[PDB]
Nucleic acid binder design. Structure first.
Lengths: 60, 100
RNA sequence: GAGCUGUAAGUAAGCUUUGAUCCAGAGAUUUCCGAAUGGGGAAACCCAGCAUGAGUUAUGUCAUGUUAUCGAUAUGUGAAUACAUAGCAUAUCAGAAGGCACACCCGGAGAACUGAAACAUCUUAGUACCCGGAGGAAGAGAAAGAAAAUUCGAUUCCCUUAGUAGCGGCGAGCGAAACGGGAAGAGCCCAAACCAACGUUGGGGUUGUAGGACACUCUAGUUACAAAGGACGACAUUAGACGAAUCAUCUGGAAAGAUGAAUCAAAGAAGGUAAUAAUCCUGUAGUCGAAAAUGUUGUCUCUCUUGAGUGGAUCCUGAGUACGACGGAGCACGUGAAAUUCCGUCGGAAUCUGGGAGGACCAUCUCCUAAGGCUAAAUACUCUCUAGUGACCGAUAGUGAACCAGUACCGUGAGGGAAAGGUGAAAAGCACCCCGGAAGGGGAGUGAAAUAGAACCUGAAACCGUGUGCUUACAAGUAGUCAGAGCCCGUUAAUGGGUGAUGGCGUGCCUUUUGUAGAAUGAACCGGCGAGUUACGAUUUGAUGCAAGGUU
RNA sequence: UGAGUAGCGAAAGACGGGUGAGAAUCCCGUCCACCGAUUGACUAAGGUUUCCAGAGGAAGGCUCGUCCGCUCUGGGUUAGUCGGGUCCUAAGCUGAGGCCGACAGGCGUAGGCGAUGGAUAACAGGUUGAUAUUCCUGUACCACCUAUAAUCGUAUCG
């Protein structure tokens, strides 16, 4: 239900960098050491990346 | 079809005739839980420290084909239909045309 | 239209009436191996060439494109042969490849065991296996035919003809066709004579009741063959939505049962629901419904496109072909008196007064025009999809497999292959106490039932045990039978039941034999499974219908 | 059933002290005995986590078991030089174009693939419950890249 591709294509590639590298990567470290609660936050960021890539390939 | 929050009357079973509110519904195997019927005795957590205090009793799920809806004007167990008078599909009684 | 994050319960963190999870249509993504195709290779791995780009003062390392072979058509195409056919060079094209239903269909190649009571001709059999090419069907197909009637008019398939004609060490055995009755049923394009053009394009022209070229006046598209591209409306497939009618009282843990009164039906199919439901729940009869994609079928559009009589002084109508001898094969037909069709070798015709066929061959008389090429329907089959049926199986059965099976397991390998379903309506899966290190038990609780406690429905026999009523330590035993004291119990109630001191008579069972206690064979014991069947023909009996008729 | 019958797979063990419900069999100590061109120390093939630590005693171990190559839960393989590839080739295998053959296919030139051989830069110590030419210390060598100097230039690369 929550779509995050209302923006243009210029700021779009900036979101795939911020969502994956600074957000999805940090949550995997805190899970390994045993410091992260709210484990459902991982599946949310995984879909935010996929929704961004679907619209990018769709615009062609 | 029985949703969560109605006022049904039990038709068959060891606790038939009584009336209660449907608090939970298990639509996969078509089971409903009615507040006041099917009490079970459960020896909870032998090894686990609740801290345990004895035997606890809650309600057990009853089959959906044993409870029936009630009528707002006559208070009797009736079937249901669909009049479709509203844009959304409404549910009406069988003994009368009022909404359930 | 309110819950949900599979089997699979747990503990966690979250999403959802601002429409989650789910059910259909169309899209995006799609690591590596595999025809695997840049090179290599022990499949799922290793090592590279070019083109920009990311990173560095710089080399190393990454990312995305691209580079196999053969074939076909363009261009450089300048060899040993001077001029020029070979080699080479690069650029193009949903060009080819490799799979699956070991079913069906054409073609190449091609056994044996077996039957003949041996065996070689023959049969099994052009069957099994292997190989190639396909298709949704394939193959066949528009008379050089079948016939003998005053004729029929492409092919294929089903009944009958008929176990007849015939073939056959005339042995075993093999085995037709036409006529007739039905399903289905449109037929057309090339070569040549000829006419304008440069061996070549187009017109022209396609046959046996003889056709065309030539001469004289003149006048419907069937895109499934027939030449082949496109915008062109109604159903149909792929998700679904409504959908009539019952209440009470007894027994029970529980009603749908029984006993009472009632009500629906174009709906009394079926399944579930604490037990057996037309009216409790999914449904059924009957109506309605499609964004989007794919089908089947149309009305117009678009693309093709002048129809017939008269005409032989002169031309055309398929050549190393038809056919013959020789060696084989195929037609029911084994070389026989073998016609009619094919293959290899070598000879080798005729040109409408023509040529072929009518079971050697000749004559007459009839029917038909070989040597180029296409063609839908009735037919065969099922790895599948969807909706249903059974005097079919019910866990040693039914597929090898109801089960996480082609899996444990067994072989270097090709390959071979099992065993294993059931607690209860509902986990409500035994809190707590006692012995014990545990395991397992004794109570208390849950439940209608716990000798229903997950090694969980019912629980047979072999076999292993614990008690007791009669009897047995001087006796020679296929272990029973008939007679019979004593002792001990009391029946489906009758000329009763259990035990057996002592006396008579008595060498198991089945196979196979002139003959078996046999020292002839088979069985350790118990349970389950385990062998004259069905289809099509013939003959003889009983029954039933009709009768010089009977029956499809 | 045979039946509480055969067997329990070459060999020297004894005692004291611990652990624990339970010890001829596990742990520690002492004495005694066996092998020692090997019953010791390294490695190739092959096996594929059997290696280490803390827990467990139902089944497996031909007895017992508190123990284990068994069970459960967490861990453990570090390379420019050591072995193999980015190097070379034997036998053999495969082979563009070609030759042959009812099909399938067979043979073979150029060219490839292929070590058990030829070439090729590192040696001493320390350290952990499990790794060492690999990690850490000490001193070296080799292929390449860039930036500065001797010196150029008929140098120079083939």
């Amino acid at each position: 239900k929550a779509k995050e591709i209302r923006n243009l294509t210029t700021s779009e590639i900036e979101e795939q960098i911020k969502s994956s590298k600074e957000e999805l990567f940090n949550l995997r470290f805190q899970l390994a050491t045993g410091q992260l609660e709210e484990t459902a936050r991982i599946r949310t960021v995984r879909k935010t990346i996929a929704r961004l890539k679907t619209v990018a390939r769709e615009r062609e | 079809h029985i949703k969560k929050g109605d006022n049904v009357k039990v038709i068959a079973g060891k606790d038939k005739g009584k009336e209660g509110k449907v608090i939970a519904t298990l639509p996969k195997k078509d089971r409903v839980v009615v507040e006041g019927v099917n009490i079970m005795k459960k020896h909870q957590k032998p090894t686990q420290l609740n801290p345990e205090s004895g035997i606890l009793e809650t309600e057990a799920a009853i089959h959906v084909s044993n409870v029936q809806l009630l009528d707002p004007k006559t208070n009797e167990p009736t079937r249901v239909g669909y009049k479709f008078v509203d844009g959304k599909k409404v549910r009406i009684a069988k003994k009368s045309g009022e909404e359930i």
